[PDB]
Symmetry: C2
Subunit: 214 residues, 2 copies
């Protein structure tokens, strides 16, 4: 419905390290500047009527640390938080804290923010495939009954609007095993801007490219 | 060191319009461009070239094309493969494809993969069905299914991984061409219309990969 026409933007955040190196600073400084850039992106997306924003840090501690304080801020901004990726092996305490963060913001009506954690597009497809395999095994599913629509219902974020636009900052032109199944029809937008420097005008530029290309 | 290039060929219609000609003229020009790209890939050591024409007469034209060009590809040591769901094409066309693939299957020069009614999601689904058959047979447990295994059941698993995807025509989308296969490929988008895409354009894409 929004003027730019897209409902779900996914971003491959790259450039944090190079940004810090340009400044003569260690990588942790760029990762912090990157976290600030994430907050700015989240506010921009919400203020621009985007339904969902999915972020992939292209490459655990910061994640672990930032969880509590960051989640409280997202909650106060009416953002619904969801973690996508393979957390099945994360220790039980972390898995519980993640669940608590999702549970807390589950009823929020603002932006739905998906954060990739140990995520891979091929893994995503495989986990869905294993779910269908189980049905087949139980005798409840004929292999010929498996079609794209069914597999689609088992890949991450199938309940949200399809990803409309994928932005990759940092200058590389590859998906790097982020979303695969989900980006079959998405506009792909590449910018040389390093993630910490990616701001509202840069995001507006990607949305405008989408609008003019759609 | 780019071993497998995939191309979404788009721009034939727009090209013909700009030249003040009918769609057919653009397609004829587009076909010459295919000939040129195939030669460039073979001449520059590219191991595999996968072509997707972005969109009963068409089918018959495919039969005709196969009948007239396969022998030459065969003499050039090119292996021809059609990727996509050809299951519902007419029986005669399915047989012509099978015979052309069979004839050139052992060739070791360039492998040329031509998409025909292909979709990246369909490709993944067909591999999933194969694994499903094995599960319903008892020869495979759902939790034995991993990336490596699914990878062995999607199109072109026997070839070098796709290293570079080029899309001509100006659009910046994959449009359900390869998905599983391009997880790590360089994506190169050019506004150049397919009929105009030449060796300089192709080299430009290879340079993007090289960088």
């Amino acid at each position: 419905l929004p003027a730019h026409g897209c409902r779900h933007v996914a971003i491959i955040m790259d450039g944090n390290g190079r940004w810090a190196k340009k400044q003569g600073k260690i990588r942790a400084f760029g990762h912090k500047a990157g976290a600030k850039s994430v907050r700015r992106a989240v506010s921009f997306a919400a203020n621009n009527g985007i339904e969902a924003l999915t972020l992939y840090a292209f490459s655990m501690e910061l994640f672990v640390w930032a969880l509590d304080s960051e989640v409280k801020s997202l909650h106060r901004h009416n953002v619904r938080l969801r973690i996508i990726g393979d957390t099945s092996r994360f220790n039980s305490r972390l898995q519980e804290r993640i669940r608590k963060s999702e549970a807390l913001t589950a009823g929020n009506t603002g932006l739905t923010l998906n954060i990739a954690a140990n995520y891979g597009g091929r893994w995503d497809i495989v986990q869905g495939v294993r779910q269908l395999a189980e049905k087949v095994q139980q005798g409840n599913l004929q292999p010929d009954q498996i079609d794209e629509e069914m597999l689609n219902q088992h890949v991450c974020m199938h309940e949200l609007a399809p990803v409309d636009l994928v932005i990759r900052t940092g200058g590389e032109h590859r998906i790097s095993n982020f979303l695969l199944w989900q980006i079959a029809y998405a506009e792909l937008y590449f910018t040389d801007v390093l993630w910490p420097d990616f701001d509202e005008q840069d995001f507006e530029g990607a949305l405008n490219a989408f609008a003019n290309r759609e």
